[PDB]
Design an enzyme around this catalytic site. Structure first.
Site, short mmCIF file in Angstrom:
data_model
loop_
_atom_site.label_atom_id
_atom_site.label_comp_id
_atom_site.label_asym_id
_atom_site.label_seq_id
_atom_site.Cartn_x
_atom_site.Cartn_y
_atom_site.Cartn_z
N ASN B 44 58.03 -22.63 19.04
CA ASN B 44 56.98 -23.48 18.46
C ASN B 44 57.04 -23.41 16.92
OD1 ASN B 44 53.45 -23.65 18.58
ND2 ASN B 44 54.81 -25.46 18.71
N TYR B 84 46.25 -32.43 12.18
CA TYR B 84 46.01 -31.12 12.79
C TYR B 84 45.05 -30.33 11.95
CZ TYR B 84 47.28 -26.31 14.32
OH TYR B 84 47.26 -25.02 14.72
N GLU B 93 41.11 -25.83 17.81
CA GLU B 93 42.33 -26.39 17.24
C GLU B 93 42.33 -27.89 17.64
OE1 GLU B 93 45.98 -25.35 19.18
OE2 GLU B 93 46.93 -24.72 17.25
N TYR B 95 43.68 -32.18 17.08
CA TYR B 95 44.86 -33.00 16.87
C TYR B 95 44.45 -34.51 16.93
CZ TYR B 95 48.33 -29.31 18.26
OH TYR B 95 49.15 -28.22 18.37
N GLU B 183 54.79 -30.98 14.40
CA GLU B 183 54.94 -29.89 15.35
C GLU B 183 56.21 -30.12 16.25
OE1 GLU B 183 52.44 -27.10 18.44
OE2 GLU B 183 51.47 -28.78 17.51
#
Ligand code: CA
Ligand code: CA
Ligand code: CA
Ligand code: CA
Lengths: 324, 327
Positions: B44, B84, B93, B95, B183
């Site tokens: 990641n 993000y 978190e 997005y 990402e």
């Protein structure tokens, strides 16, 4: 578009539109340090994007300054394409001029030259009497570097001009501003500053400090040899610390460390007792976490690497800290 | 180029490179909000330029948010091109995804949709269990808006997504971060974010300028007085002379546009104070009415005292004030 006197901060850049009465101007702010401008039949107009300061520090205390820029520049009359700004105590208006319209400033006899940025600049000192300034209507010196020939893109190593001026006895006060600027005088014109990036703290020698050589504090801090020679911080208050002589005002801190496991280990950076950021070690595998752009000032100051968010699920392993 | 985890501020933008172990990545920081990125065979990786916050304010309290961007985006495997960020208390978190590589996130069942920025987005709420976060390894919610098809440039009206989420019961804590992000997951790729501008406090829905006439303000100091030339207004003559009024700030940031003049060819200066603090200085270079604007003043929402005050008088000029406009 901006058509009246205004100051603000636009995408991180301190901008200003200033003119006196007569004629008209228009400024459009674009991203980063960029903007376009247009003016007609003015008396005096300035369009600029850079940084304003709080009048508390010399250029030395702030750090190295450099501007990289490019402009389409079409003056019709007297005009400058220049880095511009002020100092206070003493009050000085200053210029690093790379291009001009019909007249090359500023008149008088050069005090010196500097060859820098692939060019040559003559250096001058003038006086303005009862003129507009950041401190009202006043009388003040102007400092100048003026390129021997025109350009409209490249890099201006501002701090090098500043040093040259000071070496000729042109004393600079605490900084108020540095900004890439389009000036017009009894003229018309247009310009598109399509690139303009002001860098403070850029490179003009890394120091590496092994964690095991630092002073230990807290309940458990201890040396380790696996996964490297270094130290472990096991509990809240465990820390390693050392005094360091910062000879410039800004640094990056690169800590090589790891968690003991797959849980994320956090270590706080403190400078003079104040939290300046957190280093994250996501893994058991040695990694180099960098906290960049810390403005701490010149001076001997205490660097701490300390655990404060332990809850018994991980320990931090530290190998070394590098300061650049 | 950056090839290890790092945080900083570059040309005004808060940047971050983060990856877990495996594979490699590289980020090059350009001017403004811009950057390029490459990655290979990662687990990641996240590359981003935006704004980090101090965790004391909600998005409402900070202001309207909007990002204008464009990217060349060449993922090879699982990947997002997305806004993000994080909130805290609660830890979330989030997005707003405009494009992706082989897989359109995030799985599960939409809670809702939102049409905005010429696009449609489905909205989702997922859970991450023992994963990396800004608060260490933790278990937390993720909130998502995901575009129904791919786009790699335009405007994302961040605050409208946030309100959509909250109208669906997805509550947001104090802001930690908002950023344009690339990402990767179990993939390789490249991207060039050639444009990325984050705007906080921009106009939202015909908010109006307020104009307050200087002569309707409360007068203070030794000589303040009304005038009718060169306009109807007031004159401030000596240090401490000021005009003031509470103003009800319904958003956190304002521009202040004061129409005034010097009495003469000398430069008049009038200090702006909000809530007892100095926030800037209006300059009137000559005897002709002008509008001086101090823009981008972050005062916070609330009823706060605005003062316009002379502090640098020396007997060579007076300040004439017609009105103050707040926007
Ligand atoms: Ca521990
Ligand atoms: Ca070591
Ligand atoms: Ca006066
Ligand atoms: Ca009035």
């Amino acid at each position: 578009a901006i058509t009246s006197n205004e100051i603000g901060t636009h995408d991180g850049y301190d901008y200003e539109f200033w003119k006196d009465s007569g004629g008209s101007g228009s400024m459009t702010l674009n991203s980063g340090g960029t903007f376009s401008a247009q003016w007609s039949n003015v008396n005096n107009i300035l369009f600029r994007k850079g940084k304003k300061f709080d009048e508390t520090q010399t250029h030395q205390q702030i750090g190295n300054m450099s501007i990289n820029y490019g402009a389409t520049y079409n003056p019709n009359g007297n005009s400058y394409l220049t880095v511009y700004g002020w100092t206070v105590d003493p009050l000085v208006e200053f210029y690093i001029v790379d291009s001009w319209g019909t007249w090359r400033p500023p008149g008088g006899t050069p005090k010196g030259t500097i060859n820098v940025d692939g060019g040559t600049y003559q250096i001058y000192e003038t006086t303005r009497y009862n003129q507009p300034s950041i401190k009202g209507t006043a009388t003040f010196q102007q400092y100048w570097s003026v390129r021997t020939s025109k350009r409209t893109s490249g890099t201006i190593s501002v701090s090098e001009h500043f040093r040259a001026w000071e070496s000729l006895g042109m004393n600079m006060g605490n900084m108020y501003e540095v900004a890439l600027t389009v000036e017009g005088y009894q003229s018309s014109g247009s310009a598109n500053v399509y690139s303009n990036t002001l860098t403070i703290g850029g490179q003009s020698q890394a120091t590496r400090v092994e964690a095991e050589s630092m002073t230990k504090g807290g309940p458990y801090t201890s040396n380790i040899t696996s996964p490297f020679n270094g130290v472990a911080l096991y509990a809240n208050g465990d820390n390693v610390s050392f005094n360091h002589s910062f000879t410039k005002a800004n640094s990056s801190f690169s800590l090589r460390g790891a968690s003991n496991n797959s849980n994320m280990a956090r270590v706080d950076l403190r400078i003079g007792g104040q939290n300046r950021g957190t280093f994250y070690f996501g893994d058991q595998y040695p990694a180099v976490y960098t906290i960049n752009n810390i403005n701490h000032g010149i001076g001997n100051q205490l660097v701490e690497l300390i655990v404060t968010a332990d809850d018994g699920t991980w320990d931090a392993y530290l190998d070394y800290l590098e300061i650049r």
